[PDB]
Structure formats: structure tokens, C-alpha cells
Scaffold this motif. Structure first.
Motif, PDB file in Angstrom:
ATOM      1  N   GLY A 176       0.825  -1.198   0.000  1.00 35.93           N
ATOM      2  CA  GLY A 176       0.000   0.000   0.000  1.00 35.93           C
ATOM      3  C   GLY A 176       0.863   1.254   0.000  1.00 35.93           C
ATOM      4  N   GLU A 177       1.955   1.219   0.760  1.00 34.71           N
ATOM      5  CA  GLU A 177       2.864   2.359   0.836  1.00 34.71           C
ATOM      6  C   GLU A 177       3.539   2.606  -0.507  1.00 34.71           C
ATOM      7  OE1 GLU A 177       5.462   1.187   4.138  1.00 34.71           O
ATOM      8  OE2 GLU A 177       4.528   2.780   5.321  1.00 34.71           O
ATOM      9  N   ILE A 178       3.805   1.524  -1.237  1.00 36.94           N
ATOM     10  CA  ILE A 178       4.432   1.620  -2.547  1.00 36.94           C
ATOM     11  C   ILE A 178       3.480   2.329  -3.505  1.00 36.94           C
ATOM     12  CG2 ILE A 178       5.412   0.366  -4.498  1.00 36.94           C
ATOM     13  CD1 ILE A 178       6.986   0.202  -1.874  1.00 36.94           C
ATOM     14  N   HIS A 179       2.189   2.020  -3.393  1.00 35.42           N
ATOM     15  CA  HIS A 179       1.181   2.658  -4.236  1.00 35.42           C
ATOM     16  C   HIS A 179       1.199   4.159  -3.949  1.00 35.42           C
ATOM     17  CE1 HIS A 179      -1.694  -0.293  -6.220  1.00 35.42           C
ATOM     18  NE2 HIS A 179      -0.781  -1.080  -5.679  1.00 35.42           N
ATOM     19  N   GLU A 180       1.090   4.512  -2.671  1.00 37.06           N
ATOM     20  CA  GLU A 180       1.099   5.911  -2.274  1.00 37.06           C
ATOM     21  C   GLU A 180       2.380   6.593  -2.738  1.00 37.06           C
ATOM     22  OE1 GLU A 180       0.202   5.595   2.060  1.00 37.06           O
ATOM     23  OE2 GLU A 180      -1.828   6.162   1.448  1.00 37.06           O
ATOM     24  N   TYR A 181       3.496   5.868  -2.666  1.00 42.31           N
ATOM     25  CA  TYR A 181       4.786   6.395  -3.098  1.00 42.31           C
ATOM     26  C   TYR A 181       4.732   6.684  -4.597  1.00 42.31           C
ATOM     27  CZ  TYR A 181       9.880   6.776  -3.676  1.00 42.31           C
ATOM     28  OH  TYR A 181      11.162   7.205  -3.935  1.00 42.31           O
ATOM     29  N   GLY A 182       4.156   5.758  -5.357  1.00 44.10           N
ATOM     30  CA  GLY A 182       4.039   5.956  -6.788  1.00 44.10           C
ATOM     31  C   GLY A 182       3.254   7.221  -7.100  1.00 44.10           C
ATOM     32  N   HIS A 183       2.131   7.399  -6.416  1.00 40.24           N
ATOM     33  CA  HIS A 183       1.294   8.572  -6.630  1.00 40.24           C
ATOM     34  C   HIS A 183       2.016   9.845  -6.219  1.00 40.24           C
ATOM     35  CE1 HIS A 183      -1.974   6.095  -7.816  1.00 40.24           C
ATOM     36  NE2 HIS A 183      -2.201   5.584  -6.620  1.00 40.24           N
ATOM     37  N   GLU A 184       2.825   9.746  -5.170  1.00 40.34           N
ATOM     38  CA  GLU A 184       3.590  10.887  -4.682  1.00 40.34           C
ATOM     39  C   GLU A 184       4.631  11.292  -5.726  1.00 40.34           C
ATOM     40  OE1 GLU A 184       5.561  10.542  -0.731  1.00 40.34           O
ATOM     41  OE2 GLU A 184       7.295  11.377  -1.790  1.00 40.34           O
ATOM     42  N   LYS A 185       5.104  10.312  -6.492  1.00 40.44           N
ATOM     43  CA  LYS A 185       6.108  10.549  -7.524  1.00 40.44           C
ATOM     44  C   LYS A 185       5.508  10.978  -8.863  1.00 40.44           C
ATOM     45  CE  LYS A 185       9.695  10.173  -6.802  1.00 40.44           C
ATOM     46  NZ  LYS A 185      10.662  11.107  -6.159  1.00 40.44           N
ATOM     47  N   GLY A 186       4.209  11.257  -8.878  1.00 38.74           N
ATOM     48  CA  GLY A 186       3.574  11.703 -10.108  1.00 38.74           C
ATOM     49  C   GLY A 186       2.714  10.705 -10.868  1.00 38.74           C
ATOM     50  N   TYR A 187       2.821   9.419 -10.549  1.00 37.71           N
ATOM     51  CA  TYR A 187       2.010   8.433 -11.252  1.00 37.71           C
ATOM     52  C   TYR A 187       0.556   8.561 -10.817  1.00 37.71           C
ATOM     53  CZ  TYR A 187       6.516   6.569 -12.620  1.00 37.71           C
ATOM     54  OH  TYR A 187       7.783   6.443 -13.150  1.00 37.71           O
TER      55      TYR A 187
END
Lengths: 104, 104, 104, 104
Positions: free
Chosen positions: A61-72
Motif C-alpha cells: 500500500g505504501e508503494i502505491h502511495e509512493y508511486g502517486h507521490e512521484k507523479g504516477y
């Protein structure tokens, strides 16, 4: 928040990027996964993560949030996960049993 | 019968056996997969097969039939498969790109 | 080319498009799937296709090629497929058994 | 414990039971899923669950533990999950968009 041990193989891809090439996204998330104390193994079609359910699913879940934080803008993930009560088995134990039997 | 190149990661398990241990089934199918001329790579959560669509999907189907021939009554399979027109990439090329980027 | 009956639930997404919205792609492939004589059922997380292995996997492969023909550069697909020798069961039979048991 | 909204389609099966028929297991877990306040939709190849990441993944983990509590020794699960930041979309919204486009 269940804490049962689990083995989870995850394949995560970004949807809506400007290119069919997504190795930047994969590398980005892999580095994040390797920062976790949880045992993980990278392969061509995903990464296998092991540990208590809440910690493993929590990391994904954190990886998903990280992806979104990075612009995805959108992340699509496939997770194969299993739990069992008859024995403790790591991802390496799993492949070791098969390899042995194959040579037999 | 499409012949587009594809990379398919397959996770196959038997349903209804007398034991939670299924390494016999995995070893059985893996040996069958290695008999094919198609490139395959075994990992803890499945096996990655590459080649023309019809040959790859054909092999997976043959593995199912093989399982049933060996006494297994029900087989459940998860397949992650992708096709692309921008470049030719094997499973090894895929992990190589990521590893490189990770160290960068 | 195996012809064993199978039930396959497919989730197909395009990688590298300019938008996170992919309903155009889904609608495009769904119309193509409905042209096939094979029985199919659309749901929120994919489409379930049934029939002989070669015809079902053949159709999915054709859908990929169709996507590429329509301009999509990369397609990622997740397929859950099962075969069994103890009984013939359609996707509708499958949900019917569960619903019955749930009310019991 | 991430709380990002997510849509997760889950397919759960028991490994090592005495029969290829697993509708008892499916019905058992489905009843447990319907007790949750989280929105869920049952279909032939799984159940789609929506809500915050931690609550959704938490429920799936609880279902595994529930299965083991009921005597099942091993559970194998496939989860397709997605998150996005461009819009809020339920499983019903998702199929509604496709159906509309198909008739257009």
C-alpha cells in the motif's frame, strides 16, 4: 489487522504514463521495497515479499502511495498471496524443494 | 491462433489433493515445461515462459492436460502476460534493465 | 493446441497511453469479445470467457493483436483460468452454487 | 497502514482439501465478506471489495485467518487491486462507463 505469515508475489504497473517503457517506475518501487526490513526477492515478473500479513500488505500500500507521490496517476497491481498452517516456508525454501524434486 | 511474441508468468496449483504440500505437482509440471524448446525461467511464485502466443498458451494448456492425466482432478492457474510493439524483451532483459537502474 | 474446457477470467489494461482513463480500451476489447461465439460475461474487474482452451486463449491473443492494431503499444493481462475433470461448470453455474449455499 | 482508496478483486481457493469441489469454502468466506461494512460485489471468478487500503487488505487477511480457523490448512489468493488520483470510481461506476461506451 491480521498478522499471519504470508508470501506475496507482486506485479505492479503504472497506467496512463507517456511511454510503454515502465522500467523507471519498477526501479523506483523496487528501491522502496528494498528499504523495508521485510524479506523480498526481485524477479522478471514481479517481486516476492514475505512477513506478517499487515506488514506485507502495508508495504504494498505504501508503494502505491509512493508511486502517486512521484507523479504516477494510476497504479494497477496483481498479487498472488498464500498462507498455510502446516509449515513455515520462505520463497527460497519453496524453490529449493522444487529444484531438489526435479533432479529426482 | 495468434503468434505475437509474449512473456507469460504462470502460477499453477492443484485443487482437491489430499495435502497442503503441492511440490510434487510443481516439480511434475516444471519438468514438462523444461522439455519444451520455449525459453522458461522458474522462480518461487511461478514460471516465466516466452515465445509466440499460440506456442506459449498451447504449452500451458498441455500442462493442464498433463496434470489431469497424472490424476489431478482440478487445476487453478494465474497467468500474467504482456505483449508490446516497441521492443523485443526477454525475461532476462527485463530484470537487467531494472537492476541497472537500481544501481543508478 | 489443447482443447480441454476451461473458464478464464481476464483483466486487460493498456500501458503507455496518455491517460489514466482506459475505458475506451476496455469498451473496444469488450465489443471484440462479444463478437466471438464463445460464452463471455463482463464484470467490473474483467471478463470471464469459457470454452475449449485453444479457442479461449486464441481469442485473448486476438484481442491483444487487435489492441496493437488500434494503436496501443503495450498490453498487460492477468488471466485466472481453471480446468477440472469432475464436472462441467459454466461461470453462471459457479455463482449459482455459491448463492444457494449462502442462503443456507 | 496506508488508507488510500482502492478497488480489489479477490479470488481465493483452498489447497489440500479432499475434494475438487470448493463451493463450501467460497460460500463460507463470502458470508464473512458480507458481514463487513465495506462494499463488495460477488461474481463467478471472485469478489470485488472497495474502501481504504488498510481496511480492504485487512479484511482479506481476516478471511484467510477465518479459513484456517475453519480447518483449511492452506489458502491461495489472487488479488487485482488498483489505486488512482484522477477520480473516485466504484466497481459499479467502472462497469457503467464501459456498458455506456459499448452501446456507443
Amino acid at each position: 489487522m491480521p498478522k499471519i505469515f504470508c508470501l506475496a508475489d507482486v506485479c505492479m504497473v503504472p497506467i496512463g504514463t507517456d511511454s510503454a517503457s515502465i522500467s523507471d517506475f519498477v526501479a523506483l518501487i523496487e528501491k522502496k521495497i528494498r528499504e523495508s526490513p521485510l524479506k523480498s526477492t526481485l524477479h522478471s515478473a514481479g517481486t516476492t515479499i514475505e512477513g506478517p500479513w499487515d506488514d506485507v500488505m502495508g508495504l504494498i500500500g505504501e508503494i502505491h502511495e509512493y508511486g502517486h507521490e512521484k507523479g504516477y496517476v494510476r497504479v494497477h497491481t496483481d498479487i498472488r498471496v498464500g498462507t498455510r498452517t502446516d509449515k513455515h516456508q520462505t520463497a527460497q525454501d519453496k524453490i529449493d524443494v522444487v529444484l531438489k524434486k526435479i533432479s529426482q
